[PDB]
Design a protein around this nucleic acid. Structure first.
Lengths: 82, 170, 77, 73, 84, 73, 75, 65, 92, 44, 237, 72
RNA sequence: AUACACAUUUUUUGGCAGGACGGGAAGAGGAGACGUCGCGACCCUCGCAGAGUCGUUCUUGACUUGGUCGCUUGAUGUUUCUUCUUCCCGUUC
């Protein structure tokens, strides 16, 4: 498995921000992250490239569709410094 | 003593706090691209070996007389000039995107000496002159505002349209 | 609540006319009967027709092997 | 079950490959009357550079061998 | 090594406050702190310094300095900074 | 089950045309061979762009990935 | 090959958004390792405003590679 | 790539956006984790502070020191 | 055995065009995804259609403030990725 | 030329990079010289 | 005095500090200026050779000398050759050479320096011959020649420079052509090792810690010793 | 066989890589990964006005083509 | 001292299509959404700590979980529609 996959599995239970290939941004609490980067997310606030913002309860996006994630800084301590 | 490339190569080089990048200058003395502190810099020179990678320049605690001799540095955003003896400013400074200048505790005497700061196009947002004799002279604040309206924050005070208008009135 | 491959298999047996939505193409969609498929979802489709949406016209193509990569959404009509 | 290997490493230079047969006969006569027997003999070269040797080797050879290529060479 | 400042105009945005603080306190020595952890403004900024003499010198020299309209109050921090 | 691979094998040695995903190009020619990854070889090929004959290409190879579909003609 | 943990979503109405700015709504029937999905009572939401019941009970299949994301309408 | 570890690096994305951050780790797919990463678009203008980010190797174009 | 079958399938498959190209040292023209074309001789190939091409002449099409003009250049030693290949044509 | 000597002593052969280097160095030297010669002409 | 002097900022690796001149790039550009691929590196060099002759580059041009692409190319190439020339011979007075060439250009070249016993006098600017010197002179005031000499002056001059500078560098031209043929006739491993060498030469100190200073020159019983008993070393205590 | 190995042979070679995005790259190959990820030094880079960069690593799939020296 | 990294989530792709310049102001015939981060403040708020607890030992392992108003001409992208003259300050020849 990937070390970044290991981190992303540590990110579960926290609030993360996701940008997809379309450019929409989904911020919310990450329920679950598979090895394939498929992520289950809660109480998501979404901001579209147009600027419109929506709220949604449960969202699950495919791994391949994700451009990038931002995870809280709490994890930065360890154990990936090694 | 002199700021020379041999010095340019090996000072404590790192990243600012602010994550501003740089590579410092200390074989035995005065530094650049980080902590140009406490090595008795008389005249700035040999900035070329800086070769551009620097956001900030902490010149403080040297014996600098004037601020000329700046090669073209696109990256330099912040100059921390404190605790020197800057009497004058060059004028053709124009290092594009120099957003911040720290002249604190120097020896700039006259309003007219401040004129060259107007050249900084629209980038010099932050300028601090506090600790200079020129600050005591009458209508110092208003003259800096009318001379360099590019400044957004002066002496860590923010400009404000009120004293902009007063600067226009005089 | 059935896997998609079994869904396609019931399209195969029923021989229903099938409409495929292609990838990144809204303008045209393809239609016809599924006579067979493989693991890569490449489909031999009989009496296939190209359907430009932009009243709708279309081009009769006869028998076709459509590659599965284009496939966005397989349906019945 | 023998291991196959390469034995032909020769790339005929353009200037050499341009030579006609009459040219080649003449070159052999001029080179101390070189006589050949057998089928498919490549044309003689007249310069170390027509052999496609690295610069190292070239420097080294010249150094190693002084003057014109001999008829046998 | 770390100085606790308070009594500052909180109306200034976080990043401009941090850049002006680093600017002002660079005259005494290298400031190691990149960002205010406390994310509450209201003056309560901590400034971490690589050497201790620069912290003491900053404390004595910049007491009650007018900074964004207000005279800043400077003291030594109660605990050591995590980065130290 | 009649799979695309057997249908295509039966389509070998027959006049075909292939519409790529771009639709910027169609190719009509005899289907010489196709591999397990479904790359396409045609002969006597003719290129139809925008439904009009662009020209006669001849023996042609089509990258599998570009193929939208193939039909028999 | 991993299987998506979509069991929590089974027999729930969901709004799938798909490449080409397409959007469909339907009850999650089945899935596979490939993330290909069977959707019952599928309804296409065209860009205009109307919606067409493509597969009320006949059900449709959506290739997982085209599935941009999936929203749960229910809880 | 292991030499580049811990450095401040500039990645160019597939969409033309430029990201800059410390390279903490990589993987096979070239998925990168970037600490204190910020985004620049046009060249400063339109800079945002993202923080800790993963980037997907499918999106990455190139990286520079 | 497996290696053998792979090389053989390659030989009688569509690849036979690029195999034939290398053995005959014949020129072939390649329509790429950049809307540029490469006429050259095939020095080496790969299952991905990665190629080493010699005596490359690439032709392309450019639009200006008047009539479209075709532009072309010569690249003697060119190595090419395998996904850029739309089509490889072999012709007299 | 061949023996790389100026009078009696044959000097060690140097590699190209060094020869060229020193030639450019001598170049700047000659530049300095030309400058000084100039200012001098203007002062004398 | 010159502690920050670096040759690698003046010479590329393929030039090897004046050993060769890198013309592959120009084969790309120059070769493309032909809108085909029938032209090989070696055939391109064969083209360049024309410019060693005093008349060939003028009367047997690769392309029509009034072609745009061609004249542009020729400009770029000329500039390159000249800078390379003075780059590889710092010690010679550049200004002297420049002025020499310029005066040769004005006093001879543009004055009917090219003469044929049959066609008379050729003109670089109009690309035409002339019966006698008389009609040649009264043609140098005509509206045609005024136009041409007024439009194609820079190009003609650049062409000329390419000519004379390439002549002065004949040894380097030959040296490189040779290099080309060699590398070309290499194998994979060979070409690789050679490249390694050029690289090392490029990124190596100009003075090694291991150089000389002041090293000036002037001007049987084989089986018998085993039989003897030395198969086993004996010892007296 | 595998051409990527042929690229592995190409260390310390000066090349001009055209990329699928249209970008031009010029530099000396330090190494290429088997992914065909290419690490180069002393690179001038032209995005579709040249930026000069000490080291550049490129993801292999982005590479359109690489133009090698004719001396090779 | 003793094989593999071209068939759905990553790399073998759905991609392709005196003269000029800037700035700032005035006078005559660029503005409207929708967002996202900033200059000031009549305001809010009032303090030393990723945070909070415990086992063991002089330092670690476990378990839970700026916000608002103006701009009095702040900065920035989606997305529809339709320049001249004068004065000042910089670069170049």
């Amino acid at each position: 498995n990937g070390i970044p996959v290991k981190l992303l599995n540590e990110a579960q239970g926290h609030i993360v921000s996701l940008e997809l290939t379309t450019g929409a941004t989904y911020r919310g609490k990450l329920v679950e992250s598979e090895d394939s980067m498929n992520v289950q997310l809660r109480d998501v606030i979404a901001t579209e490239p147009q600027g419109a913002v929506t709220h949604m309860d449960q969202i699950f996006v495919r791994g391949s569709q994700i451009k990038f994630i931002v995870v809280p800084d709490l994890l930065k301590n360890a154990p990936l410094f090694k | 003593m002199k700021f020379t490339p041999s010095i340019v190569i090996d000072a404590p080089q790192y990243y600012v706090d602010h994550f501003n990048g740089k590579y410092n200058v200390d074989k035995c003395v005065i530094l650049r691209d980080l902590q140009l502190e406490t090595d008795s810099e008389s005249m700035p020179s040999s900035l070329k070996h800086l070769t551009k990678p620097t956001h900030i320049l902490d010149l403080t605690n040297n014996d600098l007389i004037m601020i000329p001799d700046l090669s073209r540095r696109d990256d330099i955003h912040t100059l921390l000039l404190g605790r020197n003896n800057i009497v004058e400013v060059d004028g053709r400074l124009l290092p594009m995107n120099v957003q911040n200048l720290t002249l604190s505790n120097n020896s700039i005497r006259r309003f007219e000496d401040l004129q060259r700061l107007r050249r900084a196009p629209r980038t010099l947002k932050n300028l601090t002159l506090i600790g200079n004799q020129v600050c005591h002279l009458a209508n110092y604040r208003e003259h800096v505002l009318r001379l360099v309206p590019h400044l957004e924050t002066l002496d860590f005070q923010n400009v404000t349209a009120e004293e902009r208008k007063s600067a226009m009135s005089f | 609540m059935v896997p998609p491959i079994n869904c396609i298999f019931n399209f195969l047996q029923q021989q229903t006319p099938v409409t495929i939505w292609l990838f990144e193409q809204i303008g045209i969609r393809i239609k016809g009967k599924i006579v067979g498929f493989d693991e890569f979802m490449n489909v031999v489709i009989d009496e296939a027709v190209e359907i430009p949406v932009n009243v709708e016209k279309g081009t009769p193509l006869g028998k076709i092997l459509l590659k599965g990569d284009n496939i966005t959404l397989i349906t019945s009509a | 079950e023998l291991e196959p290997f390469q034995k032909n490493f020769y790339i005929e230079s353009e200037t050499v490959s341009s030579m006609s047969e009459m040219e080649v006969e003449e070159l052999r006569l001029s080179l101390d009357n070189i006589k050949i027997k057998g089928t498919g003999c490549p044309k003689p070269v007249t310069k170390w550079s027509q052999l496609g040797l690295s610069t190292d080797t070239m420097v080294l050879i010249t150094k190693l061998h002084f003057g014109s290529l001999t008829p046998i060479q | 090594n770390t100085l606790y400042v308070s009594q500052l105009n909180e109306k200034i945005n976080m990043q401009r406050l941090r850049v002006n603080l680093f600017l002002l306190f660079a005259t005494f020595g290298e400031v190691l702190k990149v960002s205010m952890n406390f994310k509450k403004q209201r003056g309560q900024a901590f400034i971490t310094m690589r050497t201790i003499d620069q912290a003491s010198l900053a404390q004595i020299s910049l007491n009650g300095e007018r900074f964004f309209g207000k005279p800043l109050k400077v003291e030594f921090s109660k605990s050591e900074t995590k980065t130290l | 089950p009649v799979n695309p691979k057997p249908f295509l094998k039966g389509l070998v040695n027959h006049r075909v045309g292939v519409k790529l995903k771009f639709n910027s190009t169609e190719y009509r020619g005899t289907l010489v061979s196709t591999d397990n990854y479904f790359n396409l070889q045609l002969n006597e090929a003719e290129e139809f762009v925008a439904g009009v004959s662009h020209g006669t290409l001849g023996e042609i190879f089509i990258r599998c990935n570009n193929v939208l579909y193939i039909r028999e003609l | 090959v991993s299987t998506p943990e979509l069991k929590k979503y089974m027999d729930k109405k969901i709004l799938l958004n798909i490449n080409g700015s397409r959007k469909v709504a339907g009850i999650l029937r089945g899935y596979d390792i490939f993330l290909n999905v069977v959707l019952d009572d599928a309804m296409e939401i065209n860009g205009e405003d109307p919606a067409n019941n493509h597969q009320l009970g006949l059900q449709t299949v959506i290739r997982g590679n085209s599935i941009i994301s999936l929203e749960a309408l229910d809880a | 790539l292991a030499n580049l570890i811990d450095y401040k690096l500039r990645v160019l994305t597939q969409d033309g956006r430029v990201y800059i951050g410390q390279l903490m780790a990589f993987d096979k797919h070239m998925n990168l984790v970037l600490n204190e990463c910020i985004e620049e678009r046009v060249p400063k203008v339109e800079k945002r502070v993202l923080g800790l980010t993963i980037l997907r190797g499918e999106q990455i174009l190139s990286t520079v020191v | 055995e497996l290696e053998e079958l792979e090389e053989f399938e390659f030989k009688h498959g569509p690849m036979s065009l690029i195999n034939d190209a290398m053995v005959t040292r014949t020129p072939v023209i390649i329509s790429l995804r950049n809307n540029h074309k490469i006429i050259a001789r095939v020095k080496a190939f790969d299952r991905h259609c990665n190629m080493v091409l010699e005596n490359v002449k690439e032709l392309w099409t450019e639009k200006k403030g008047k009539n479209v003009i075709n532009r072309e250049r010569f690249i003697s030693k060119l190595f090419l990725r395998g996904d850029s290949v739309i089509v490889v044509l072999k012709t007299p | 030329i061949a023996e790389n000597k100026i009078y009696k002593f044959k000097k060690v052969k140097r590699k190209r990079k060094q020869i060229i280097l020193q030639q450019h160095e001598i170049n700047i030297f000659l530049r300095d010289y030309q400058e000084k010669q100039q200012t001098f002409n203007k002062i004398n | 005095r010159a502690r920050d002097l670096d040759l690698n900022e003046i010479f590329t690796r393929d030039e090897q500090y004046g050993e060769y001149m890198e013309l592959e790039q120009f084969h790309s550009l120059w070769l493309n200026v032909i809108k085909r691929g029938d032209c090989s590196l070696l055939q391109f060099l064969d083209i360049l050779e024309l410019f060693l002759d005093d008349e060939k580059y003028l009367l047997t041009p690769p392309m029509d000398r009034k072609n745009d692409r061609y004249m542009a190319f020729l400009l770029k190439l000329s500039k390159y050759v000249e800078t390379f020339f003075f780059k590889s011979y710092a010690l010679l007075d550049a200004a002297a050479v420049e002025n020499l060439i310029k005066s040769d250009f004005e006093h001879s070249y543009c004055r009917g320096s090219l003469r044929s016993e049959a066609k008379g006098i050729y003109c670089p600017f109009c690309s035409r011959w002339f019966k006698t010197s008389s009609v040649f002179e009264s043609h140098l005031v005509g509206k045609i020649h005024k136009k041409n000499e007024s439009k194609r002056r820079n190009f003609v001059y650049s062409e000329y420079k390419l000519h004379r500078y390439l002549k002065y560098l004949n040894d380097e031209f030959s040296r490189t052509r040779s290099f080309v043929e060699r590398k070309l006739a290499f194998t994979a491993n060979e070409r690789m090792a050679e490249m390694d060498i050029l690289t090392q030469k490029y990124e190596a100190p100009a003075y090694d810690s291991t150089e000389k200073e002041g090293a000036e020159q002037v001007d049987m019983p084989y089986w018998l010793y085993k039989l003897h008993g030395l198969d086993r070393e004996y010892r007296c205590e | 066989m595998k051409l990527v190995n042929f690229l592995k042979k190409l260390r310390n070679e000066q090349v001009t890589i055209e990329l699928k995005n249209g970008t031009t790259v010029w530099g000396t190959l330090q190494s290429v990964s088997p992914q065909m990820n290419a690490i180069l030094t002393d690179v001038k880079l032209t995005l579709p006005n040249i930026a000069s960069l000490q080291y550049i690593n490129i993801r292999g799939n982005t590479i359109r083509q690489i133009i090698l020296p004719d001396s090779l």
